[PDB]
Write an enzyme that holds these catalytic residues in place. Structure first.
Site, PDB file in Angstrom:
ATOM      1  N   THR A  81       0.873  -1.219   0.000  1.00 37.96           N
ATOM      2  CA  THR A  81       0.000   0.000   0.000  1.00 37.96           C
ATOM      3  C   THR A  81       0.893   1.247   0.000  1.00 37.96           C
ATOM      4  O   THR A  81       1.753   1.354   0.893  1.00 37.96           O
ATOM      5  CB  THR A  81      -0.983  -0.010   1.184  1.00 37.96           C
ATOM      6  OG1 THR A  81      -2.144  -0.747   0.796  1.00 37.96           O
ATOM      7  CG2 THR A  81      -1.407   1.371   1.636  1.00 37.96           C
ATOM      8  N   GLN A  82       0.702   2.142  -0.973  1.00 32.56           N
ATOM      9  CA  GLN A  82       1.468   3.413  -1.077  1.00 32.56           C
ATOM     10  C   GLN A  82       0.503   4.552  -1.434  1.00 32.56           C
ATOM     11  O   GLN A  82      -0.730   4.349  -1.355  1.00 32.56           O
ATOM     12  CB  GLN A  82       2.610   3.322  -2.101  1.00 32.56           C
ATOM     13  CG  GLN A  82       2.811   1.956  -2.746  1.00 32.56           C
ATOM     14  CD  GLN A  82       1.873   1.761  -3.908  1.00 32.56           C
ATOM     15  OE1 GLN A  82       0.656   1.873  -3.761  1.00 32.56           O
ATOM     16  NE2 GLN A  82       2.444   1.493  -5.074  1.00 32.56           N
ATOM     17  N   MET A 100      -2.499  -6.203  -1.673  1.00 38.11           N
ATOM     18  CA  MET A 100      -2.598  -4.867  -1.020  1.00 38.11           C
ATOM     19  C   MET A 100      -1.350  -4.034  -1.343  1.00 38.11           C
ATOM     20  O   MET A 100      -0.906  -3.261  -0.471  1.00 38.11           O
ATOM     21  CB  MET A 100      -2.745  -5.014   0.499  1.00 38.11           C
ATOM     22  CG  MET A 100      -4.028  -5.698   0.913  1.00 38.11           C
ATOM     23  SD  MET A 100      -5.480  -4.728   0.446  1.00 38.11           S
ATOM     24  CE  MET A 100      -5.395  -3.414   1.664  1.00 38.11           C
ATOM     25  N   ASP A 118       8.319   2.351  -0.015  1.00 42.80           N
ATOM     26  CA  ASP A 118       7.444   2.424   1.186  1.00 42.80           C
ATOM     27  C   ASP A 118       8.267   2.775   2.434  1.00 42.80           C
ATOM     28  O   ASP A 118       7.673   3.314   3.385  1.00 42.80           O
ATOM     29  CB  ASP A 118       6.672   1.117   1.390  1.00 42.80           C
ATOM     30  CG  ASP A 118       5.592   0.863   0.348  1.00 42.80           C
ATOM     31  OD1 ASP A 118       5.450   1.696  -0.579  1.00 42.80           O
ATOM     32  OD2 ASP A 118       4.892  -0.167   0.469  1.00 42.80           O
TER      33      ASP A 118
END
Ligand code: MG
Lengths: 233, 195, 195, 4, 225, 222, 125, 204, 211, 195, 4, 4, 195, 4
Positions: free
Chosen positions: A1-2, A107, M90
């Site tokens: 997820t980003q 995800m 991330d």
């Protein structure tokens, strides 16, 4: 997820009698900053397919490499790589669609909306959409982002249903696409005047146009506008 | 949590109200009377947030008693219930609403009829043959749906209420320390000692 | 992207014409240069609603000032803007440049950021697109420039601001404030883009 | 929202 | 979808006739074109109650102002009074209005947002279908439009919204305000979405529904004698 | 954050006859207030006289239909080309859906076909694989609009025999394919009027012993 | 400052007369003649435009005023008092009726509202 | 938590040939628990009928409020209020509580005594008017009622036919909603007579 | 609403047939009793899928036991297979409230309540009304150990009707089962719409209604 | 909430455990035995989170029974308690800890002495003359502080425990539906029927 | 609520 | 999802 | 404030020397220009820890590349940076400009923003202070400038960036990459401030 | 942390 960082705006496209047209402006936005003004977002695959990509540009460049690697792999132990066993638009799309849905399901999505324009072996127009959720749909006209809201209404006035595709010439289809890009330049805050346009015709093949500009713009009426209501000077 | 039940029989209204006052894991009292006499033939039982319950009941009691002195006349249960509802209906949109649920049991001397009214803290009013507030509510409703009849006597009404309380003592997970039962008929308001 | 620049003969106000609701351009030919007095104008940045509300009140205050005490100073106009912006700083998102021509004080520019502080400057820039031209404007601004020089400086400056800022775009509007009077200039994309 |  | 289009000798405003409660269509034929004054009309988007309420209130105050001044009302007056009201309530009154009209000053077209910002234009669009409508307006608008051209462009911009927007639907309402003429209100100017005949009549045989009780209701007053 | 789910709207309808079954759905695919396609099929022939539709999140629906289609292919391979009965298909789909119990498929699934006695069958699933055989089922956005109508007009609910005054119910009767298609068309026509996510087109798949045939009808495009 | 006249300026005299109301009626008597006639299919109201000066533009002074599209008013007595009553009458037609019922008040109820405004000037401080 | 679905209930109104019909369920509950099956949601002020769904305290409060307002109207106007006018009064009264609204879904039904024209209207909780020719729905099963009405309804139905249509519309919508049912009432309204019918329906 | 109670005549099992998606009535015709084998029943409450899937799975595990031990599994053993399974998934959000009802020579008539919480309880009567599970019937007044089978079937049927009326999320029809030595017996599906009016007229109950 | 008490007298250990099993406002059972026999002279009572309680007790029971068979010997209560503590001490830092509080009552045949151990879900262990878990804890501790003696007989121990339960029934606000009492002495583990 |  |  | 500029004879890398922990300057003489190969350098912006960790790995990868396949291309260096930045996007806050001199490809500049995307550009700017010189740099950059011209362009550009950005300051460091070799230049405040 |  980003979260997406460097992004591309609307990709717009439609079917016509003999093939498909697709277009996208040459801008990579960094939020409100128009950072890169030389970014190509239409990536041809062989001489029968163009992939138009919006969203995160890092994820676009990844997909660009997957497609480049797909062509290489198809050629391996394939004497008919440039003939009967060449990559079809439908093959290239289903591959991306598989990747997009797999990545959303882990995800960690590729933060993009993708339109695969092309012509098949039998001369059938191919135009299908996939995005970061793995959602897919086909229509005589497809558009991503702002294009969905502003381009589709204008393109659907040319091809409203399946029966209007044979009555639509390439002259008429290109005119509609070029007009749509001007409208998007007018109302889209993250748009660019510079864009690329690709025609995939079942007779004339792939025509890729670079360094196109929005022209014949109406601004003259602006001089007659003063204040927000009660000003007259 | 607090049990307040009401059953309207042929010629009276019976109100059963739990005797325990609990704040958290502590029993403050085991002999609490959750009722006020509004007028000689009108009784109100109440359950809800601490202070609010008594404060609201005593405020209603004072207003009805004032009306009685001023007109030398007893307001009908229908009239008293409508007043109470309107006071609760005001409170919900106030700065701090009264969190009080009430049953109003009355005997209308003009119509020679017993009347039971269930009103929640929002000011939601209904006339019922039988009513209840809280967790006990659902169970007593299902049980009374079966056994209740309109032409029941006061004694029959007490036995059916006795069965409800017995059943609630088993089924409910909190000790509500028994109930106080009060009958409202033409002769006025009396408390049943044996229960 | 808004700026006011003092030169030899007076002051020039410059602005873009783009109003955004998110990434949608609500109005592409907006007039962000607003008259508060004959030769006192302001540039509006921040909330369209807040800056209009402020501008409308200031115009009222200066009209009433003129009726009683005659033509107000540019400093006076700036003070009325500051008073509204400072005292209502918790409820306002307004960045306003005030520019005006007296015969005594000649060209004057006052900038009012979010806080509601006032700064008198030879020239001022503000809005989202201003950040990209701090370097350019500082290197290229001289005092006592000609009208033609000052128009070029603003045109080039906002041209860059529009180029890099997505929230800035459309036509470049300018308002020239001199003894001669009030001149309105417009420059279209085809002109300023190729600079 | 409208908001240079 | 609400649009306003300036033309040679006046202004035209148009709207669709759909009101929604979540994804459900509450009203299939609803009037979004409001009379502020005989020759000042405005189209409303946003909270349905708020658009009606704010136009009726200003419409009332404009009528009293017209009587007080012995002058036909001006669009700038309605515009000023609307924006000051909406600004007071800091957007909590969700009214997005296109305000048009003709007055002794000439023909005017304004938009006003819920937070109390106003703007001027030759062509405006507001509501969920604004982007569909603006696309058509940006493609087909020119300076010095005739009346017939302006109505066409306006109703075309609404159609764009009706077809391509789930928020907009049903019919097209138009109002033409031409200088030195009575404003003509064309209710259901177009009817592109007429429902096709059903396959079956669902009219039930009488006595199909089971009835517990029957009674006469007394709607009359207390009677004489 | 990143939300893995979306709503593509649309509505599906399954009706079971005596010797036939129909699975119908609108051809509209939406996102928020935008139309994605006016013709994007949602009801699919899966082989062995089974028709399937997973309506809700289009991506999850496409994925489930693919997996079931694949499930039918491997049933043939592993069981000497045995025909997959509708009851067996239904149980197989329950296991597909429950597989993703803690990351569900946001779809309402209906399958239609013939039972092993040759009678019309409709099976209805929730997102996590709870299923039940029914005479009637509507799924998707306009399910709440259509189901009550089907209760009244297919099962004859709250309908009594005139002159009895609620003493004798209207007799339950198998509807003809021609009667069923009218109810499907009127259901969708009605749903289209009052639901913004329903319209554009209606595609009906009819299942008989003879096979699977397809009917298409236009719906209002507003 | 403050309005320290919180008491009635109109009181009963020993004879039971309200002096200021009688004196107000005397002012009305001095005023120019106005009349009204009701027909089967309409009503007419009329008065004389008593011009204060021939240089004055008598058209600019309106003695006959529209209150609602279907209600007109004319007066006899003090013009200024009439002008402010017309202003108040037009407003109360909106605030106390049209903004509630979405229609203009019937004649008798608007009259009732005007009457109320004039009774208050007879008792208020 | 959501005020408009605590107590539950439904109202539906339809127009016919020289007649209108308004119908409601009889349930009042505390969410899942059913409390009363005698809670009528249709009230009448003269010949104008008002159905109210939503929070029950507000149903009762608005009934008392409109009785108050229509009583004063009649005394001053010396005539009964008409449906068109009463619709405007409901709208006014709801919008004056814009930022603290009554959690209700009102429905007006009646025949204009002078013109004889059948009239129905619905409202949102802040008083926006829906003036439909065909039908108006309100309550926890509005989706269900929209579906039933949209298929069952045809224009210019005779009073005794219209009765069957509105009845079947309510009954089948109510059976697909948890918080609706426990009995139903149907008013058939003609220019100078009004019949009121209680319907047999499943009690769960 | 699910009811399972024990008496001299064996086990009575009564359940409603309503499924709800919030305030939306998904179905009025759901089977809330699973027939695991001729001598084993399972009631279903909570998640429709969780119950259907795992009680079907229980039937598979109970069958494997019979093949490997040549004997029907005891109600105690069958209940504990399901209780030990759900306990592995504890905290994951499984919603399940089930009564495993059966007869075996070893144990006699047996009811085990199994919970997604991991709770496993033996008892003579278990009830699931609204979202709460009780060790007593929805009425409990009519309950005596020595009851006629067809008298006991009524109490079960009547008890579901009581809850079906008051509870918005209970209704549709009543499904009745009688568990004995030599297996269970289905005692039919009774529509609550028809059952209510019949019971009212015959019993003279539900006076607070009217009809 | 659940009552579990323990009292170690001269020649035995007595464990009183509440009979009610409740989930929210529902009474699931009124005859629950919150105990497992670990070995012939060792008894463990338990209270805490649903499932965890029985699952943990049965797991401990199985491990102690395995040790007994393998060595043909009974582990001392001290040893059993240390094992149980170490199992709980592991669980707190595990992915999902066992939320179980236990009392371990045993008679050590080697030392001819009764032993009571109180262990919480964290693995906190103490040997006590008397122990308790939950809301009842504080009250029973204050009461036993007064009345308890080391040289008390089993009969004296039961009377003092009878007084505790009586007092808890009044004072506690939940119906715990009475207790099951079990004695652990040299002769083994027996259940007291009359209580 | 109602909301073009 | 559905859930007596 | 960091930039790399291509000119006729090769490429020049420029950077400020200010490291901030909040509003405190941790290091006022930082070296933000780091060698990954003899004639492949990079400019580091974002997290000091993240950019060092990346730069240290890239230097390792190119050392091992050189051992096996000889001198790597600037494009190759950029690709290794991208691979680390994209795959670990991330957990990384790194904005890196890669600049290098081949004899075949001459001067080349690659910019890698947060996303981990790669952009080949004639010149590149990055860091907090870059926003203020977008206007200036665009107007003043020409292709095939001389060394002296390019040093002036970078000196003036960063001079402005340092002036307006609080997070930028100290000395201007530059590294010249040509066929001639590698030259290090430093410019002190007293020099660049008076520009 | 340290962070041009
Ligand atoms: Mg721009």
């Amino acid at each position: 997820t980003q979260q997406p960082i460097v992004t591309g705006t609307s990709v717009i496209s439609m079917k016509y009698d003999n093939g498909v047209i697709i277009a996208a402006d040459n801008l990579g936005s960094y939020g409100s900053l128009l950072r890169f003004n030389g970014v190509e977002r239409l990536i041809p695959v062989g001489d029968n397919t163009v992939v138009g990509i919006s969203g995160d540009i890092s994820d676009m460049q990844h997909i660009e490499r997957l497609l480049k690697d797909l062509v290489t792999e198809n050629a391996y132990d394939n004497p008919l790589a440039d003939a009967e066993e060449a990559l079809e638009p439908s093959y290239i799309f289903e591959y991306l669609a598989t990747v997009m849905y797999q990545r959303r399901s882990k995800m960690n999505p590729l933060w993009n909306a993708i339109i695969v324009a092309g012509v098949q072996s039998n001369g059938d127009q191919f135009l299908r959409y996939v995005n970061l959720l793995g959602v897919t749909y086909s229509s005589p006209t497809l558009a991503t982002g702002f294009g969905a809201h502003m381009a589709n209404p204008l393109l659907r006035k040319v091809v409203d249903r399946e029966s209007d595709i044979p009555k639509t010439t390439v002259q008429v289809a290109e005119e509609a696409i070029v007009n749509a890009m001007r409208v998007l330049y007018y109302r889209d805050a993250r748009s660019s005047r510079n864009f690329s346009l690709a025609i995939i015709d079942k007779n004339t093949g792939l025509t890729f146009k670079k360094n196109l500009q929005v022209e014949n713009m109406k601004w003259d009426f602006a001089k007659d506008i003063k204040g927000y209501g009660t000003q007259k000077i | 949590m607090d049990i307040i039940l009401g059953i309207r029989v042929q010629d009276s209204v019976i109100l059963a109200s739990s005797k325990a006052v609990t704040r958290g894991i502590s029993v403050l009292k085991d002999s609490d009377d959750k009722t006020r006499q509004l007028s000689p033939h009108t009784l109100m039982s109440f359950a809800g947030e601490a202070g609010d319950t008594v404060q609201f009941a005593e405020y209603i009691q004072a207003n009805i008693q004032l009306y009685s002195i001023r007109e030398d006349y007893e307001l009908s249960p229908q009239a008293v219930s409508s007043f109470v509802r309107q006071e609760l209906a005001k409170s919900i949109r106030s700065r701090r609403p009264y969190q009080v649920n009430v049953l109003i049991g009355g005997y209308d001397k003009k119509k020679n009829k017993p009347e039971l009214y269930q009103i929640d803290y929002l000011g939601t009013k209904v006339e019922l043959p039988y009513g209840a507030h809280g967790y006990s509510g659902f169970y007593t409703f299902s049980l009374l749906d079966h056994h209740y009849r309109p032409d029941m006597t006061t004694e029959e009404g007490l036995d059916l209420l006795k069965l409800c309380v017995q059943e609630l003592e088993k089924r409910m997970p909190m000790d509500f320390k028994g109930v106080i039962v009060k009958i409202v008929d033409k002769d006025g308001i009396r408390q049943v000692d044996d229960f | 992207s808004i700026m006011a620049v003092t030169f030899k003969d007076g002051v020039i106000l410059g602005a873009d014409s783009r109003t955004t609701t998110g990434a949608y351009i609500a109005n592409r030919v907006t007039d962000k240069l607003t008259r508060v007095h004959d030769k006192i104008w302001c540039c509006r940045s921040g909330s369209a609603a807040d800056t209009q509300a402020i501008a409308d009140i200031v115009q009222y205050h200066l009209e009433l000032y003129t009726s009683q005490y005659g033509t107000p100073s540019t400093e006076t106009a700036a003070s009325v803007f500051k008073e509204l912006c400072y005292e209502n700083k918790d409820n306002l998102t307004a960045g306003i440049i005030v520019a005006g021509y007296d015969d005594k004080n000649k060209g004057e520019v006052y900038t009012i950021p979010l806080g509601g502080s006032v700064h008198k400057l030879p020239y001022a820039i503000a809005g989202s697109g201003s950040t990209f031209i701090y370097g350019y404007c500082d290197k290229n601004f001289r005092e006592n420039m000609s009208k033609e020089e000052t128009v070029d400086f603003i045109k080039h400056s906002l041209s860059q601001a529009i180029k890099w800022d997505g929230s800035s775009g459309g036509v470049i509007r300018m308002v020239v404030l001199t003894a001669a009077g009030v001149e309105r200039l417009i420059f279209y994309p085809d002109e300023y883009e190729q600079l | 929202x409208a908001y240079x | 979808t609400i649009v306003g289009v300036k033309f040679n000798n006046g202004v035209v405003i148009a709207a669709d006739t759909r009101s929604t409660q979540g994804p459900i269509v509450a009203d299939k034929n609803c009037a979004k074109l409001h009379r502020i004054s005989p020759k000042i009309w405005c189209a409303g988007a946003g909270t349905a109650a708020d658009t009606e309420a704010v136009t009726q209130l200003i419409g009332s105050n404009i009528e009293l102002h017209s009587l007080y001044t012995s002058r036909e009302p001006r669009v700038v007056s309605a515009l000023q009074m609307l924006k000051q009201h909406l600004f007071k309530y800091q957007g909590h009154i969700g009214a997005y209005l296109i305000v048009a009209g003709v007055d002794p000053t000439g023909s005017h077209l304004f938009s006003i947002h819920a937070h109390g910002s106003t703007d001027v234009g030759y062509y405006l669009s507001l509501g969920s279908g604004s982007l569909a409508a603006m696309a058509v307006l940006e493609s087909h608008w020119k300076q010095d439009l005739t009346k017939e051209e302006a109505i066409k462009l306006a109703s075309d911009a609404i159609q764009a919204g009706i077809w391509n927007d789930l928020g907009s639907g049903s019919n097209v309402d138009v109002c033409v305000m031409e200088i030195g003429k009575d404003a003509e209100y064309l209710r259901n100017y177009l009817t592109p979405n007429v429902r096709e005949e059903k396959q079956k009549s669902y009219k039930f045989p009488r006595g199909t529904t089971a009835v517990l009780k029957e009674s006469i209701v007394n709607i009359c007053d207390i009677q004489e004698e | 954050q990143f939300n893995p789910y979306g709503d593509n709207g649309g509505t599906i309808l399954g009706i079971a006859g005596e010797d036939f079954a129909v699975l119908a759905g609108d051809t509209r695919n939406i996102t928020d207030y935008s139309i994605n396609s006016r013709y994007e099929p949602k009801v699919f022939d899966c082989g062995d006289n089974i028709v399937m539709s997973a309506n809700g999140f289009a991506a999850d629906g496409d994925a489930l239909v693919k997996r079931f289609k694949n499930s039918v292919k491997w049933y043939h391979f592993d069981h000497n080309d045995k025909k997959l009965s509708i009851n067996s298909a239904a149980r197989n789909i329950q296991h597909l859906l429950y597989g993703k119990r803690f990351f569900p498929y946001y779809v309402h699934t209906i399958i239609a076909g013939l039972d092993e006695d040759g009678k019309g069958a409709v099976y209805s699933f929730d997102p996590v694989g709870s299923y039940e055989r029914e005479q009637c089922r509507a799924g998707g956005a306009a399910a709440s609009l259509i189901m009550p109508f089907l209760d009244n007009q297919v099962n004859f609910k709250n309908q009594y025999e005139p002159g009895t005054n609620g003493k004798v119910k209207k007799p339950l009767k198998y509807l003809s394919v021609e009667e069923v298609i009218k109810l499907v068309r009127d259901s969708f026509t009605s749903a289209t009027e009052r639901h913004i996510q329903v319209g554009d087109g209606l595609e009906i798949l009819i299942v008989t012993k003879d096979g699977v045939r397809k009917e298409f009808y236009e719906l209002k495009r507003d | 400052m403050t309005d320290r006249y919180s008491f009635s300026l109109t009181t009963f005299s020993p004879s039971g007369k309200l002096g200021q109301i009688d004196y107000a009626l005397t002012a009305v008597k001095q005023g120019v003649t106005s009349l009204g006639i009701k027909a089967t299919n309409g009503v007419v109201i009329a008065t004389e435009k008593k011009s204060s000066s021939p240089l004055a533009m008598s058209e600019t002074l309106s003695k006959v005023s529209l209150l609602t599209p279907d209600i007109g008013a004319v007066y006899s007595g003090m013009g200024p008092d009439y002008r402010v009553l017309v202003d108040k009458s037009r407003k109360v037609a909106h605030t106390s009726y049209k903004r509630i019922y979405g229609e203009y008040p019937p004649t008798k109820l608007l009259v009732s509202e005007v009457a109320k405004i004039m009774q208050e000037a007879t008792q208020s401080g | 938590s959501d005020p408009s679905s605590i107590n539950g209930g439904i109202v539906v109104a339809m127009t016919g040939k020289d007649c209108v019909a308004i119908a409601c369920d009889l349930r009042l509950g505390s969410q899942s628990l059913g409390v009363s099956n005698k809670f009528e949601k249709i009230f009448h002020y003269g010949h104008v009928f008002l159905g109210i769904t939503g929070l029950a305290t507000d149903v009762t409060t608005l009934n008392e409020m409109f009785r108050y307002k229509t009583n004063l109207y009649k005394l001053k106007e010396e005539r009964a209020i008409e449906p068109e006018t009463f619709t405007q009064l409901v709208s006014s009264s709801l919008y004056e509580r814009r930022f603290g609204p009554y959690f209700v879904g009102p429905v007006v039904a009646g025949i204009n005594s002078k013109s004889g024209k059948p009239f129905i209207a619905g409202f949102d909780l802040i008083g926006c008017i829906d003036e439909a020719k065909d039908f108006i729905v309100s309550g926890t099963a509005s989706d269900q009622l929209f579906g039933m009405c949209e298929s069952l309804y045809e224009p210019n139905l005779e009073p005794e036919d219209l009765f069957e249509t509105i009845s079947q519309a309510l009954l089948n919508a109510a059976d697909r909603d948890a918080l609706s049912g426990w009995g139903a009432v149907v008013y058939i309204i003609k220019k100078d007579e009004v019949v009121k019918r209680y319907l047999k329906m499943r009690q769960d | 609403t699910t009811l399972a109670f024990r008496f001299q005549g064996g086990i009575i099992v009564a359940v409603d047939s309503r499924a709800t998606a919030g305030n939306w009535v998904a179905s009025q015709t759901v089977k809330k009793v699973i027939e695991i084998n001729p001598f084993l029943l399972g009631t279903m409450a909570g998640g429709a899928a969780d119950c259907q899937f795992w009680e079907t799975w229980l039937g598979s595990q109970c069958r494997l036991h019979e093949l490997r031990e040549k004997e029907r599994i005891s109600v105690a053993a069958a209940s504990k297979i399901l209780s030990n399974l759900v306990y592995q998934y504890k905290g994951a959000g499984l919603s399940m409230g089930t009564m495993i009802c059966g007869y075996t020579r070893k144990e006699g008539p047996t009811i085990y309540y199994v919970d997604s919480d991991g709770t496993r309880l033996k008892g003579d009567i278990f009830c699931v009304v609204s979202g709460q599970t009780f060790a007593y019937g929805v009425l409990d007044s009519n309950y005596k150990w020595d009851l006629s089978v067809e008298d006991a079937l009524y109490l079960g049927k009547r008890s579901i009707l009581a809850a079906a009326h008051r509870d918005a999320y209970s209704g549709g029809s009543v499904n009745l089962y009688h568990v004995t030595e030599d297996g269970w017996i289905y005692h039919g599906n009774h529509d609550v719409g028809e059952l209510f009016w019949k019971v009212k007229e015959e019993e003279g109950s539900f006076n607070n209604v009217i009809g």
